[model samples]
Target chain A: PQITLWQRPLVTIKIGGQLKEALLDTGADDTVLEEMSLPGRWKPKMIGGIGGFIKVRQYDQILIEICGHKAIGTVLVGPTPVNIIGRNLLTQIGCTLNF
Target chain B: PQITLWQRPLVTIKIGGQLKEALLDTGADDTVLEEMSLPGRWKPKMIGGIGGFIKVRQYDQILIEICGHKAIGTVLVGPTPVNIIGRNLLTQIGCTLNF
Candidate 1:
């Protein structure tokens, strides 16, 4: 399947209860974050996908701001709390999906 | 404080010396890696900013394949690598800026 850049959906997320904004991507299956910025309550776990399971952990619910709207959800705790937001939060927002 | 996505540069970064592709965001200032997926030598370091300094570690130079071109560069090794690809590499690529 060929994926074009224009077809992907991007959103913003606020990690660690901070007011900072980051981009959320729907192409990913797991909620990924920068492990360094991840909060202490978040523990490490393994998340698996069709490619295979990459060692990842689930974090305590954090406030996420999506498309100017905010909510709290379980974010995958990791080293760098960065972009690459996934379906867990993205599903709630109405956006475009390209297959 | 008023910024738009249309002004942001979205590029893909291959983290951990892996051939896999991930988005590189210039607005960010650090290279984030997934600790679990990250290999040895590519360990943890403390890399943070005005929010505060996040505990991050430097890593052995990895072969960063950017924009169909392969080059070796320093990536901030961490627990889970995600988007938010920062200045370390984004500076090299030609892009747009919106402030």
Candidate 2:
């Protein structure tokens, strides 16, 4: 799959048995998702962005299928402007930046 | 250039006669940089992310050399955690996301 930068690199993602759109964010170090309910326990964590920092619910070992590629890692649930597939998950999917 | 997801896709950039590193962020609609002194007129603007919205100084028609590729676009100066080269500038450099 090749996504041109002419637009936001949003892709379909399946998580928690639900389908959603997420952006492929190379600038983000960790994946951040909108507020959602997930199984198991989650820890409160703080993450920084263009603004300051926001408290998020960190759910580890979360399974997400991005563009048909499955990846398991920590997913932070918070008041994110949009769902983001960060390097943590991009690496698992073997995503790369090309020019 | 091909950048693997094993690490942050950071690239050296030349802006206003200074060399700095920035991340190629496909998730961001606008380019944002750390606080810097730029020439010409600018306006105050606000941008949001995973955390929240932050006030920034918007500088338009700024020339940036990203990985040696020249791109002219709007650059926002703010207190960001990291300098981000968003889609606005990425497209000018013909950056793409590949898997």
Best by DockQ: 2
The reply for model 1, stretches above 4 Å from the true place, is A1-4, A7-11, A17-21, A37-40, A48-53, A79-82, A96-99, B1-99
Clashing pairs in model 2, backbone N/Cα/C closer than 3 A: none
lDDT string, candidate 2, B1-99, tens digits = 899977877889999999999888888899999999999999999888766788999999999999989999999999888899999999999888989
Candidate 2 Cα misplacement greater than 4 A, ranges: none
Q: In candidate 1, what are the lDDT values of residues A45-81, reduced to their tens digit?
A: 7763222355557776766776565656667754433
The TM-score leader among the candidates is: 2
Compute the interface RMSD for candidate 2. 1.0
* lDDT for each candidate structure: 0.48, 0.91
Q: DockQ of each candidate's interface versus the true one?
A: 0.03, 0.84
Span of ten consecutive residues with least summed lDDT in model 1 chain A? A1-10
Candidate 2 lDDT at B24 equals 83
